[PDB]
């Protein structure tokens, strides 16, 4: 039936989107620069802007149009940087663009046509692979861009967290008979950060990295305050920290994040709290401290013992002899000289490939996005 029949059947959409060269700057403006992150569509389908962008890349490749391909990827990358500069003080917008930049990168891989990335693809998804261009070079650029966005997300979340840490982990006291933010404030805030990331469809492997980084920041700020303040080094602070850490650990358990590396970053703080609790008088007490505090430096152990504030009914001041016993024993240990931890340290981030089951041929364009000048192919 190669000739025409009536009625004429509507075409079967292939999951591509065409646009006119003259409309490129409008396209990125509407889909990136002035896109509302709280829009219904882009939250019902997390990563929608990235998918739409990819579908557009797809049509340009289909037409074997190298010039349109180059121009679109360059506009897409520059616009993402643009919106990150203007709006990057806000956690929501940075989480949103980190997630869409990752999804865009994942799409470039999943539909590259390279066999190594096609492994979880359906037959249909494989029909959607690029056929004319190798975009490996652009992927590296997007990954570097994603590294920069992550570092900004960490700066944003640190600025929200930092004022809560000391107050929440150290200063709130309820213990009786033994001598503003709470632990709940911190737990709620971690919950909020994590809920937003999940709702944005951020990679679970990336979310795990963000969580490890947030727990590192908690532990480092808290421990640095113990090492600078006499009033924070006491048996009862030790008990309160021990409990606060247990709740943070239970947050990890509840969210199934026990593999994020988050817990392990608390180990110095944990051992400091334990040190505040143990006996500090005899040679045996000293040996036990040295073998217990394997994750603290000699400088940190010694500092805690010097600052230690005794409650006389229960204990005494730590003696100069005892500290000298600790120092002699720790001579055989080859430790780091650090006293304070670097609370600004950022673990290097990775973006392991996370293919999607979304079927591009089922995507439709909502009017709200202001993209009527685009058409489906």
Numbering used by the authors: 1461 to 1639, 1658 to 1855
What sentences appear in the manuscript?
Type V myosin (MyoV) motors move protein complexes, organelles, vesicles, and mRNAs along actin cables. The C-terminal globular domain (GD) defines this class of myosins and mediates the majority of cargo interactions. In vertebrate Myo5a, the GD also mediates autoinhibition of ATPase activity in its cargo-free state. In this study, we describe the high-resolution X-ray structures of the GDs from human Myo5a and Myo5b as well as low-resolution SAXS-surface envelopes for all three human MyoV paralogs.
Indeed, a Myo5a fragment consisting of residues 1467–1855 (Myo5a (1467–1855)) was resistant to degradation and not prone to aggregation. By performing molecular replacement with the derivatized structure as template an atomic model was built with this native dataset at a resolution of 2.2 Å (Rwork = 0.22, Rfree = 0.26). The asymmetric unit contained two almost identical Myo5a molecules with a root mean square deviation for the c-α backbone atoms of 0.30 Å. Both molecules showed electron density for residues 1461 to 1855, with the exception of a predicted loop region ranging from residues 1640 to 1658 (loop I). The overall structural core of the Myo5a GD is hook-like shaped and its overall structural arrangement and connectivity is conserved in type V myosins. It consists of 11 tightly packed α-helices followed by an extended region that clamps the entire structure like a bracelet. The peptide chain ends with a short helix, and a C-terminal two-stranded anti-parallel beta-sheet that folds against the very N-terminal residues. Previously reported point mutations at residues I1512, M1515, and D1521 in the Myo5a GD are almost completely buried in the crystal structure. Thus, these Griscelli mutations are likely to destabilize the GD. Fitting our high-resolution X-ray structure of Myo5a GD into the low-resolution electron density of autoinhibited Myo5a allowed for only one possible orientation of the GD.
